[PDB]
């Protein structure tokens, strides 16, 4: 019973670690997103000119 109990805990742990990693990983794309959005703003400024 002890062994099985512990096992389940490790499964829990790795689940959380995966989700955490995934979230922080996904957080980086916003960098590029911001870059390109701002770039479009500047482009529109030039068009206005």
């Amino acid at each position: 019973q002890f062994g099985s109990t512990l096992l389940s805990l490790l499964e829990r742990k790795d689940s959380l670690s995966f989700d955490a990693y995934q979230m922080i990983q996904s957080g980086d794309l916003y960098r590029f997103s911001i870059d390109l959005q701002q770039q479009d703003i500047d482009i529109n400024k030039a068009s206005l000119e």
Binding site: F32, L36, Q39, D42, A46
Partner: protein
């Protein structure tokens, strides 16, 4: 005849100055295209990452 040549010159003057403005406009197009190129690069970089 003299006055006729005068009018002809008036026309040529207006004509060339308008073409001059157009020659300016294409520069703005060039600038925009450069900004566009930058954006495309960013897109590639984003996909890559």
């Amino acid at each position: 005849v003299s006055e006729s040549y005068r009018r002809r010159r008036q026309e040529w003057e207006l004509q060339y100055k308008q073409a001059e403005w157009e020659v300016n406009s294409v520069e703005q197009q060039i600038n925009l295209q450069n900004m566009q190129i930058k954006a495309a690069n960013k897109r590639l970089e984003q996909v890559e990452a």
